[PDB]
């Protein structure tokens, strides 16, 4: 792939805003570009259990 970096323009709106639906933005973008960690962790149906 090849995605957003620090020197990009025109894609700042949803950067620090919470996200509905599937995630595609990396965590590092919020880590070193936004101020706080995103308060949205997308769950999966692939639970992990033991017998």
């Amino acid at each position: 792939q090849a995605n957003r970096s620090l020197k990009t323009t025109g894609n700042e709106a949803s950067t620090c805003r919470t996200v509905t639906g599937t995630q595609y933005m990396g965590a590092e973008v919020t880590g070193q570009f936004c101020q706080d960690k995103p308060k949205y962790k997308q769950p999966i149906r692939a639970s992990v259990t033991t017998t």
Partner: protein, 87 residues
């Protein structure tokens, strides 16, 4: 869409569960199963860049705990034409 995403893993349980993650997370068409040999097994999906990236990110993040885990997770967005016969 010519974007190519793909990952190998030790054991085929992670391979097929990650393939299901690929096809369920984003609209991507699978193009390859590969018995690499020596325990490496490769899933190979093809689609547009955004869908490929989202699907592979989700599948990789959901693949570590399953089975023996991943081997590598990286994506080439524009494979060359000559790579297609070597799919």
């Amino acid at each position: 869409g010519i974007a190519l995403g793909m990952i190998e893993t030790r054991g085929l349980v992670p391979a097929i569960e990650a393939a299901d993650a690929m096809t369920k997370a984003a609209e991507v068409r699978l193009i390859g199963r590969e018995f690499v040999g020596g325990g490496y097994v490769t899933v190979l999906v093809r689609g547009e860049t955004g869908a490929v990236n989202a699907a592979v990110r989700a599948g990789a993040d959901a693949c570590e705990r399953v089975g023996d885990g991943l081997v590598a997770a990286h994506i080439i967005a524009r494979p060359h034409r000559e790579v297609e016969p070597a799919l």
